[PDB]
């Protein structure tokens, strides 16, 4: 329900796969322990599950931005956070770092007003992820 | 009120729903995983799984919001970008996604949820 938010959602929808690929490669360059033996992205099936989870988080951010509401993050977003922590064994700082890389890869396609409008959604998901053990 | 519970159910089981739907679709259309198909190689299968997941997530979000506007908004955008992957395979994939999703609901939940799958299938049939 906004012109600029519709344009940003369009950009994030056209480039969802490229954004996820760039963000994941950045994250695995920065954090070599994730693709090391014992890491959450060592094997191929684990890597595919990580890519699908990062994609889900990007989609949720894009939907919340298109809507203009951050409610869905506190609703179904926490369910996905808990599922990624529990089922995939992803430590909280790895989830935050993945969302941060997703944020930077997404804002690399926008300008300045768009990036300022978009960043609070990534930031809110990061905040929801960091207060998990509380 | 109920839609938050339905969206929670589809989010807790997003991976299982997508897996069941994709396996059902590939049993139904064996040409998809045959040589030349869009799900033949392993990377092809991963990309197909991510696309089906995106469609399921859009449906789940439209159900959580109660609005189908985003379908006419970014759904057609993604369809056009992904095609320029054949379009008529997407239809049956959404049908399988719907069946796998409704297998987890009852009767009121399924009756409330199915119209979103129906709308995305109908919007996807008007593509040229
Ligand atoms: Cl901690
Ligand atoms: Cl940051």
Author numbering:
A (entry chain A): 3 to 136
B (entry chain B): 5 to 88, 92 to 135
Original authors' sentences:
Our previous efforts to develop a far-red FP with improved performance relative to other FPs yielded the small Ultra-Red FP (smURFP), which we created from the α-allophycocyanin phycobiliprotein through 12 rounds of directed evolution. Unlike α-allophycocyanin phycobiliprotein which requires a lyase to attach the chromophore, smURFP formed a covalent bond with BV via a cysteine residue without needing a lyase. Furthermore, smURFP is small (16 kD) relative to the GFP (27 kD), and yet its molecular brightness is equivalent to the enhanced GFP (eGFP) with a fluorescence quantum yield (QY) of 18% and a large extinction coefficient (EC) of 180,000 M−1 cm−1 at 642 nm1,11,12. smURFP was successfully incorporated into genetically encoded far-red and near-IR ubiquitination-based cell cycle indicator (FUCCI)11 and Förster resonance energy transfer (FRET) kinase sensor. The structure reveals that smURFP is a homodimer, and polar, π-π, and hydrophobic interactions mediate dimer formation.
On the other hand, apo-smURFP crystallized from a solution of smURFP with 20% BV attached, enabling us to determine the structure at 2.8 Å resolution. We observed that the asymmetric unit contains a hexamer with three smURFP homodimers. Each smURFP monomer comprises six alpha helixes (h1-h6) connected by loops. The interface is also stabilized by two salt bridges between h2 and h3 (K18, K19 to D55 and D23 to R54) and a π-π interaction between F65 of h3 from each monomer. Hydrophobic interactions also contribute to the interface, most notably L68 of h3 and I78 of h4 of the counterpart. In our structure, we observed that C52 is located at the edge of h3 within a pocket that binds and subsequently covalently attaches BV. Importantly, the smURFP chromophore pocket is formed by amino acids from both protomers, which agreed with our previous directed evolution studies that indicated that the dimer was required for BV incorporation. Whereas allophycocyanin hexamer is composed of three heterodimers of αβ subunits that partially overlap side-by-side to form a hollow disc, the three homodimers of smURFP form a smaller pinwheel-like structure. The comparison of the chromophore pockets revealed that the pocket in the smURFP Y56F mutant was larger at 663 Å3 with disordered loops compared to smURFP, which forms a smaller pocket (576 Å3) with a compact and rigid secondary structure.
